[PDB]
């Protein structure tokens, strides 16, 4: 057997209010989790995740092959050269089981100055036809803002945890410019499940996706209640329990950089499970030009021998690197 990872449940509701001592006690919990396995469940988060899952299911189960080509990213459809990030990521039956739909900041509109400049990592979202998917675009865009609000609160907790003022990260996480993304991932039940779509870890575990660190500041994840994630600890890979009422939170490698690995980006992987399920990450990304000076909360003077890295450089290089390491998703 594999041991269960320590993934505490943290009531994050004080991070939405004005009781400062209560916020500090939440920050301590975040600090402890960040120093241990690197994962926790945010509870009392205020998001209607059941409705999120229902609206996502209705989308995934009704979208047609024709629509998928029409929304496809460049990796699947050469006609769509502007779609590097946003759009549909197709399955390849017999070979690749997972499929997904990614969207970015709704404020990245044709008139947005970064869209006008064609700055890397900024794209205008693509959507299915409203008559085929009534309400879907509006639901999805509202979800973006609901999970942006939770993420802002969580970033206040991380800042406090690190000995900073609560706006330390959140001041770089702004509606008009965030590079954050939502991905609506569908993992299918398949009978038979093709072996080509199953990877095998060095330890023999069957996987849907190999070990990695997240490309994010933090990742704010809703999943179905089907156990699948594993985190590498000093005691080996451990199973992260599912909890479809909470959000699973972890740091990404930008946090690791900024904190000189005080808050590591935990290495994790996705086990193969033959189940129809959802994985709905929000990758908390800053603005293209956001730069935070790296520091070290284990050093008396707080100084780090890491150099400042802009978030846009981090992100563009990280997303390419992850594709090269673990394959196009
Ligand atoms: N396209 C997004 C970035 C996606 C980066 C990415 O591929 N991340 C991985 C690891 S967190 C990811 O999304 N993995 C998924 C998972 O962990 O369930 C799935 C998949 F990508 F298919 F959705 C899988 F594991 F299968 F790769 C963006 O532009 O912001
Ligand atoms: Fe991940």
Walkthrough of the structure:
Helices cover 28% and strands 19% of the residues. α1 crosses α5 and α2 (49-62) crosses α5 (136-161). The protein is globular. The chain has 8 helices and 13 strands. With 329 residues, the chain is an alpha+beta fold. β6 and β7 form a beta hairpin. Fe (iii) ion (FE) is lined by residues 212, 214, 268. It is classed as oxidoreductase. The entry lists the keywords B-lactam antibiotic, oxygenase, penicillin biosynthesis, antibiotic biosynthesis, oxidoreductase. The assembly is monomeric. Isopenicillin N synthase complexed with L-aminoadipoyl-L-cysteinyl-L- hexafluorovaline.
List keywords for this structure.
329 residues, alpha+beta, Jelly Rolls, 8-stranded mixed β-sheet, 5-stranded antiparallel β-sheet, 13 strands, 28% helix, binds ligand HFV, binds fe (iii) ion, EC 1.21.3.1
In the CATH hierarchy, what is the architecture at level 2?
Answer: Sandwich
Helix count from the secondary structure assignment: 8
Give the total of domains: 1
Along the chain, the helix and strand elements come as EHEHHEEHHHEEEEEEEHEEH
Largest sheet: spatial strand order: 1-2-11-8-13-5-4-3
Protein structure class: alpha+beta
CATH class: Mainly Beta
Q: Could you give me the name of the CATH homologous superfamily? A: B-lactam Antibiotic, Isopenicillin N Synthase, Chain
Q: Report the biggest beta sheet as strand number plus sense, adding barrel if it closes.
A: 8 strands, mixed
Rg from C-alpha positions?
A: 19 Å
Shape: globular
Number of strands: 13
Report the helical percentage: 25-40%
Provide the list of bound ligands, each named once: the ligand N[C@@H](CCCC(=O)N[C@@H](CS)C(=O)N[C@H](C(=O)O)C(C(F)(F)F)C(F)(F)F)C(=O)O, fe (iii) ion
Distance from N terminus to C terminus (CA atoms, Å) equals 29 Å
Beta fraction of the residues? 15-25%
CATH fold annotation: Jelly Rolls
PDB class: oxidoreductase
Keywords: B-lactam antibiotic, oxygenase, penicillin biosynthesis, antibiotic biosynthesis, oxidoreductase
Assembly: monomeric
Entry title: Isopenicillin N synthase complexed with L-aminoadipoyl-L-cysteinyl-L- hexafluorovaline
């Amino acid at each position: 057997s594999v041991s269960k990872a320590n993934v505490p449940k943290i009531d994050v509701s004080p991070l939405f209010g004005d009781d400062q001592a209560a916020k500090m006690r939440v920050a301590q919990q975040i600090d402890a989790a960040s120093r241990d396995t690197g994962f926790f469940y945010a509870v009392n988060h205020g998001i209607n995740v059941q409705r999120l899952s229902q609206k996502t299911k209705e989308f995934h189960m009704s979208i047609t092959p024709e629509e998928k080509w029409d929304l496809a990213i460049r990796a699947y459809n050469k006609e769509h050269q502007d779609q590097v990030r946003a759009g549909y990521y197709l399955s390849i039956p017999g070979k690749k089981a997972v499929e997904s739909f990614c969207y970015l900041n709704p404020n990245f509109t044709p008139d947005h100055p970064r869209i006008q400049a064609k700055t890397p990592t900024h794209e205008v979202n693509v959507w299915p036809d409203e008559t085929k998917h009534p309400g879907f675009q509006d639901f999805a865009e509202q979800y973006y803002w609901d999970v942006f609000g939770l993420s802002s609160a969580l970033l206040k907790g991380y800042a406090l945890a690190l000995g900073k003022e609560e706006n330390f990260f959140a001041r770089h996480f702004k509606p008009d410019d965030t590079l954050a993304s939502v991905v609506l991932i569908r993992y299918p039940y398949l009978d038979p499940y093709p072996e080509a779509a199953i990877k095998t870890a060095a330890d023999g575990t069957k996987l849907s996706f190999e070990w990695h660190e997240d490309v994010s500041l933090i990742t704010v994840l809703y999943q179905s209640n089907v156990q699948n994630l594993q985190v590498e600890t000093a005691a080996g890979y451990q199973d992260i329990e599912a909890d479809d009422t909470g959000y699973l939170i972890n740091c990404g490698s930008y946090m690791a950089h900024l904190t000189n690995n005080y808050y590591k980006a935990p290495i994790h992987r996705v086990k193969w499970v033959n189940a129809e399920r959802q994985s709905l990450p929000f990758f908390v990304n800053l603005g293209y030009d956001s730069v935070i000076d790296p520091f070290d909360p284990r050093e008396p003077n707080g100084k780090s021998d890491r150099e400042p890295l802009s978030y846009g450089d981090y992100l563009q290089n990280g997303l390419v690197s992850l594709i090269n390491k673990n394959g196009q998703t």
